[PDB]
Write a protein that binds this DNA or RNA. Structure first.
Length: 268
RNA sequence: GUGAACCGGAUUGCCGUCAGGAAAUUAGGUGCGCUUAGCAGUAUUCCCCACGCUGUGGG
């Protein structure tokens, strides 16, 4: 079975007061870490019932869950929705017990058993990371002059199109190229949002040796994280019920640890 | 093992009954925070592993 969970954030109100929930969404790494803190081990929960001990990733279960962040929901109020799809039951009352300021509504969870027959029309929403891997010559310095270096870099960069092609056509072709393998066939696809997603990651770096021995003194260095994001919505038709269920709960692209793979399907 | 050694200033006691700081006070007169900007139609996306001469998988 699948577990589907929904979280709500205000992202509104008085701008002259602290808003930890709205500020929490400025870094995708922080969002991923906070969502990962919702799956504690059976020993950590017994030892620390209040989540008041130092946080170590080795004490939390590893499981490839997926999530997406949606915005602009109305009713005279602003809302940001976080939708999480997982293969395990989340523990929201352990993750947000000391951070109830973050949310504007209690978390909700439910079961999900999608059974689809062959040749069924579905309405889908999903966000992609438009990335391709290429060999790039290394240009450096640019101190008024460009100096080339002989090394060729294997780098994952953004998807590009020609001057006579619209981004929508390029993305539709790029998705229809792989849609045979995933297990569905498109009928219409339109691009809604195209942009970037940013984040920062801490990394330990050694500085000096310990006089008493047994380790170093260490410090933190921050590494940037940039991704190309494109949101799509449209209609699809199931080819075979076997590969489609594998496409779900797995992702349809890269950067799946930063909310970049999730298929949302409605029966039309 | 020294004008040194042995060596208690000790026993008893309430400072209690008395007291209005009180009559009177406007802190008022004058003042633009103003000149400025796509979260988007791109030409390298920070790191690692495997298969090829771009496609999978992890942060």
């Amino acid at each position: 079975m699948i577990y589907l969970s929904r979280l709500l954030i205000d992202t509104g109100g008085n701008p002259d007061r602290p808003r930890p929930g709205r500020k929490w969404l400025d870094n995708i790494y922080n969002v991923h870490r906070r969502l990962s803190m919702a799956f504690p081990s059976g020993l950590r929960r017994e030892q620390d019932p209040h989540f008041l001990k130092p946080f170590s990733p080795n004490d939390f279960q590893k499981t490839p869950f997926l999530f997406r962040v949606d915005n602009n929901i109305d009713g005279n109020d602003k809302r940001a929705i976080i939708i999480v799809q997982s293969v395990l039951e989340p523990d929201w009352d352990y993750c947000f017990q000391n951070a109830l300021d973050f949310l504007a509504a209690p978390p909700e969870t439910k079961e999900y058993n999608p059974e689809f027959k062959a040749g069924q029309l579905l309405r889908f929403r999903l966000r992609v990371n438009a990335s391709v891997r290429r060999h790039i010559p290394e240009m450096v310095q640019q101190d008024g002059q460009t100096i080339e270096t002989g090394k060729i870099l294997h780098k994952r960069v953004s998807l590009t199109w020609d001057a006579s092609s619209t981004p929508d056509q390029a993305l539709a072709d790029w998705l229809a190229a792989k849609s045979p393998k995933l297990g569905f066939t498109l009928q219409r696809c339109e691009l809604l949002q195209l942009g970037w997603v940013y984040g920062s990651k801490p990394e330990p770096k050694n500085v000096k040796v310990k006089e008493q021995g047994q380790g170093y003194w260490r410090e933190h260095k921050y590494n940037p994280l940039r991704f190309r994001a494109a949101l799509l919505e449209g209609v699809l038709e199931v080819d075979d019920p076997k590969l489609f269920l594998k496409t779900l709960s797995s992702g349809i692209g890269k950067a799946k640890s930063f909310g970049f793979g999730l298929l949302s399907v409605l029966p039309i």
